[PDB]
Amino acid sequence: SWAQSRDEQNLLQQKRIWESPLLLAAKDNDVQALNKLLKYEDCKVHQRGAMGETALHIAALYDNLEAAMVLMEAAPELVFEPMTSELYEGQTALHIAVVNQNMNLVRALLARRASVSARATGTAFRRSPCNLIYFGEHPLSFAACVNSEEIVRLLIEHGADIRAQDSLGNTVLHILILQPNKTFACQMYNLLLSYDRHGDHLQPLDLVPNHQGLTPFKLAGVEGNTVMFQHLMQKRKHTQWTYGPLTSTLYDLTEIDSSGDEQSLLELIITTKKREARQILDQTPVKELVSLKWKRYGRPYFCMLGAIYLLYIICFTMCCIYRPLKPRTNNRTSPRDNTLLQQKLLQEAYMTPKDDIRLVGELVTVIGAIIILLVEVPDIFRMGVTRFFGQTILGGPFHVLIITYAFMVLVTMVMRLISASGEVVPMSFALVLGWCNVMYFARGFQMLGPFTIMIQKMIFGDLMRFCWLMAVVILGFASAFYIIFQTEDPEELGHFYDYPMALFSTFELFLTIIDGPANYNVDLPFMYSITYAAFAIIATLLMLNLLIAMMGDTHWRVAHERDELWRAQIVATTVMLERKLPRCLWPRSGICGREYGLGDRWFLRVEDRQDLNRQRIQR
Amino acid sequence: SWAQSRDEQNLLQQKRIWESPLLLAAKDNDVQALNKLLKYEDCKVHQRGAMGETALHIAALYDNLEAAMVLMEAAPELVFEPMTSELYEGQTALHIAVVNQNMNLVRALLARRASVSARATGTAFRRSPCNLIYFGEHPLSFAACVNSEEIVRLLIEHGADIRAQDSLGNTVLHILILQPNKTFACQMYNLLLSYDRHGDHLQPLDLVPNHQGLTPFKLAGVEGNTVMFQHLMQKRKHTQWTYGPLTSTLYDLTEIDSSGDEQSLLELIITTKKREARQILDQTPVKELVSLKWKRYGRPYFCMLGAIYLLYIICFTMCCIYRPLKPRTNNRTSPRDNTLLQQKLLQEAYMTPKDDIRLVGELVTVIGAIIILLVEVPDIFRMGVTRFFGQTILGGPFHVLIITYAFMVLVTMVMRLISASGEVVPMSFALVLGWCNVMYFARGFQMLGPFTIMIQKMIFGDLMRFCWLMAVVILGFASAFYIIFQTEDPEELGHFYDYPMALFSTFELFLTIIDGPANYNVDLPFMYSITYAAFAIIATLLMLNLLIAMMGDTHWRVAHERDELWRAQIVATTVMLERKLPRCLWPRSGICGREYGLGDRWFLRVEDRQDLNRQRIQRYAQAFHTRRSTSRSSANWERLRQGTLRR
Amino acid sequence: ADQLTEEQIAEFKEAFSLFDKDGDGTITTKELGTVMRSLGQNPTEAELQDMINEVDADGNGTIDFPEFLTMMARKMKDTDSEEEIREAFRVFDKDGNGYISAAELRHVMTNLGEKLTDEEVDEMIREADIDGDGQVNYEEFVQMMTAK
Ligand SMILES: [Ca+2]
Ligand SMILES: [Ca+2]
Ligand SMILES: [Ca+2]
Ligand SMILES: [Ca+2]
Ligand SMILES: [Ca+2]
């Protein structure tokens, strides 16, 4: 019961207005009530509301100009008074007039020496999905979000700075990105920079980080505000000559590479959770960058790397299919021929030249198993645990399979030193998950592998919520069959000789694999025939064929949102490969600078065609 | 690596501007600076740029009029100076002012007797996918593409001929077809032909080939500039009488037939790689033509051809199922009953009257197989190897099957003369590929075979990319089963007694074919049930049904671009049938001329019915005139609106 | 015809082609005469030269397409000047003929999806087409864009 108390308090605000004679006269513009009640009687006008009101706030809140002017005389000091506590802390009456976008009360309040640095630190202003808005803390920031120019111009001209910060360290620039109205707030961003008159030694207001260290450029990259990203790009590109329909631009390439430790754009984009931020990669100075980092310098190191893992798994299976085996030892088949097995796993036999070769490749797998683990030690000692799941889902959700591959290789190394019995079960998981993990490289070789996105997209979700409705209809019917052949001799119809196999036996019928039980020579009981017919027309005609059409629908609701995933995942393949690989190979891309006397920043260039009918309509 | 060295030279330019006092004063119109720096000191203005500029070039390139006018007084000769090396060779400043669509400096430059005959032989001017433009060479050609009429007109009045050619041999006309803005360049093509006032006795400019021998008429057909192709068709049609709403014109039909050696349109249409070039077959003198070539004289020779192929294969199978067989010779089944086979193939037994009949038909298949190779001797010896693949994919992608059919028939003709043992292994490939090769005739016999295009279209691509993700999941799990039934006695569950069959065994479980291994009488190990259900849930519940839906969506993205492939493939079938077939049957198409007093050109007439369109012709006449599922459909327009609007 | 747009050339070229009955590239008195009196009325064969010599810039007795185009420049299209419908038509029109067709509008909607039926596309074009050729002008397309 957290949000209920907010509503509980909010009705309690009204009742105080309903019972105080001043405040209800403050809610309306009952001038002669306020004429008579104020000057005559001897009452204290410092009556706080339910959430800490004054009389001047209510007149401000219910847009009541002329009542506030009469309040100016009797209240020389209520201008300086803030609101009291726990939701609206410090919200003075200067703020509330700004939210109603004008009253010319700012005229009155700044005539009444109102402070412009009182900070609204209340609960209902912090950035949260509980509140429906976010307006910062300072009264300048209130005027900025409602897009009201002449109030903003007024506030600079009375001594308001433009460099205040919130609890999160956000400037007034950062607030404009988080507004939901995009194009109607882009104009404000140019206006406030015009009042950056003082050339400061520290930074020129555009490089100010927050408490998690973000320039307003990068924060717009995080939130996917494309139109704002497009407009701030304009001040960093630098145009060279133009030649008819050609144009030679020169993008800046400073805060968008992985040069610094800040990582500054691209690790910030792929580690988002929001969907819309992946749209940024289609913009012009970025899409050109990663296409150069992949067509050159990314693809051959990747495919040469994926060839190495392919030679690893082959070396594993060769030292898998040759195992030290012997014939069965002295224990003959003691159950009555329900016990057929014949080999049992040699103890300490190595004395062949053949086993020397097998010893070599077996050590190759073990040394490789250690290498996988030591890479992943600094990974999950820093990036939490569920924080790693936030890294996981997008483009690298295998990343534990290669971990659980390594545990199974270690256990079978531990197993043969102990020389214990059940050594076939760790070899099993270490063999499927080995070959399944090469599907990680389906991003490569061409765009002939985005299946590994879609098969991921469908093994979760679509199969998974279909699996339970399998798992109950099988659970009755299999249990129904174990009763119905309880009487019978299992020498015929060995499908159902006991309950635990009868589930798995029924499971083969649900997917149309086993042939379906029949004997034709012994009359099987008369309740089977009705029941098993009822099984088929649910399972292999209604239930399964539902899954194809349900699969058939979901294939083309993700037509568009499949292809951009693939080009997103290459970026995730790129930067991870850049981060773990040292230099003196595939250098920091783009053209180096300051040899041309241009700056320490590095650059790259793009040509294009204007399609000059746009020039020709430009009348 | 090559693109950076182009780019690095470009940044290398700007440093030369930022260090020179002259050219930086030439980038801006700093006339106060430009006046004092030139006339006072003793410094030459021959300061070459990094890509070999002159100072006169820069004012044009940064479009600065009033600076270069001052430069004319100091520099009488630098108009004649070209640019230096390896990207912009011979580019004079007359080019650059033209590309800026005016400067009224062409006034001043031609006042300084500037040559109009300079050639820009540089690197970045050649036609290439590296460059983004193609303006040709000559300054007349540069004015052609930016579509500036008076700039063109001014150049004819200074002795600029229109018959310049590039290294490709293209005229100025051929440049205009390759320009991407199509109808806005259609107007220039009429303007330049008006300046062919001197009818030269060679050809009147509309017939000049390039170095690969192409008219400007044919060139639009290669590149699919249909609107330009529509316009050049207009000068060839020759209309007769009109009758109310009827009209009977008479199309030209000269450069679109397979009469000459030039091959003239149709082979050049089908041999391209471009997809949009196939569109020309919808246009009016062509679509009408090949229907007449097909319904008359095209279909009935084609169907009568294929039936001879049908009696060929039938004659092969009869001499396939009858082979000389003996019972098994003296060697008994020496492995312990794991070696059941019983005949081993008679050695030199023909001495029967029955097998002489078999001797007849077995020769005929050999005789026909030689003929197949005799058709395909010149084809491989001329049309490259990759060049043959360009022929392959569009309309003839079988064409090696019929080659390999000719191999295996000649193998089994060799194989019985030496009379070695392994004679069945060519006889398999020489049989299935034979019956599959009759599917070549699915184009004909009606439009009830465009499948053979889609089954081509889908066996590559879709099934091809699906085969790998089979081939690894099966490769682990088959290797998984061999480990767990390694311990077992294969007298029960004889699926997995050895490794190479276990892959083949697993392959049948993946496609829901074999029964699924179970015994119910002997207990199988406890790792089987965990592995197998995990195999079943991927292979025949997740992976395979994913194929159908992935096959589902790709059926109707290509519903429209399938049917025109069929109608394209008839035309490609038609011409190949014409080329390798002599005349004195199915005569040269259309109606012959010059008996009617017209000329050696041959023609066909087309009747058509127009419409009136009364509501549109009122507003043009008044321009002369002096002093349901509607809400369903409009919601789609709203869906067209909301998806496009800004978002 | 100081400045025009591609569509304005292309549609007027279709007008000039429809108006030129014999396809000689010129317009004579006989040609303009019949099609004008096809439409109900009849000018008395003196207005016809008074139609041509009003507009014939060189007095050659013929109206070539440039003279036809600059006449329509004086009978100029209205003030429907935009920028996005201009861009929207370029993405739709593949070959750039100036007339978005049936199969083209099927093609662009297919890449967006929604599975339009063949009859449903014909319901779109026939209502949007003002004059009735089964093809949408640039002028016809903006009237579906702005309001209904
Ligand atoms: Ca079966
Ligand atoms: Ca005419
Ligand atoms: Ca004229
Ligand atoms: Ca079109
Ligand atoms: Ca129309």
JSON list of N, CA and C and ligand atoms in Angstrom, two decimals, chain A residues 513-515, chain B residues 513-515, ligand 1:
[
{"chain": "A", "resi": 513, "resn": "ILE", "atom": "N", "xyz": [6.01, -40.12, -33.37]},
{"chain": "A", "resi": 513, "resn": "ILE", "atom": "CA", "xyz": [7.30, -40.75, -33.59]},
{"chain": "A", "resi": 513, "resn": "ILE", "atom": "C", "xyz": [7.20, -42.25, -33.50]},
{"chain": "A", "resi": 514, "resn": "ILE", "atom": "N", "xyz": [6.76, -42.76, -32.35]},
{"chain": "A", "resi": 514, "resn": "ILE", "atom": "CA", "xyz": [6.53, -44.18, -32.22]},
{"chain": "A", "resi": 514, "resn": "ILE", "atom": "C", "xyz": [5.29, -44.56, -33.03]},
{"chain": "A", "resi": 515, "resn": "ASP", "atom": "N", "xyz": [5.19, -45.83, -33.37]},
{"chain": "A", "resi": 515, "resn": "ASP", "atom": "CA", "xyz": [4.29, -46.26, -34.42]},
{"chain": "A", "resi": 515, "resn": "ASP", "atom": "C", "xyz": [2.84, -46.38, -33.96]},
{"chain": "B", "resi": 513, "resn": "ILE", "atom": "N", "xyz": [11.02, -40.27, -40.16]},
{"chain": "B", "resi": 513, "resn": "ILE", "atom": "CA", "xyz": [10.95, -41.33, -41.15]},
{"chain": "B", "resi": 513, "resn": "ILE", "atom": "C", "xyz": [11.07, -42.70, -40.50]},
{"chain": "B", "resi": 514, "resn": "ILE", "atom": "N", "xyz": [12.18, -42.96, -39.84]},
{"chain": "B", "resi": 514, "resn": "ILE", "atom": "CA", "xyz": [12.37, -44.23, -39.18]},
{"chain": "B", "resi": 514, "resn": "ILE", "atom": "C", "xyz": [11.54, -44.26, -37.90]},
{"chain": "B", "resi": 515, "resn": "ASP", "atom": "N", "xyz": [11.36, -45.45, -37.34]},
{"chain": "B", "resi": 515, "resn": "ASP", "atom": "CA", "xyz": [10.33, -45.70, -36.36]},
{"chain": "B", "resi": 515, "resn": "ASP", "atom": "C", "xyz": [10.60, -45.07, -35.00]},
{"chain": "D", "resi": 1, "resn": "CA", "atom": "CA", "xyz": [5.90, -45.34, -38.64]}
]
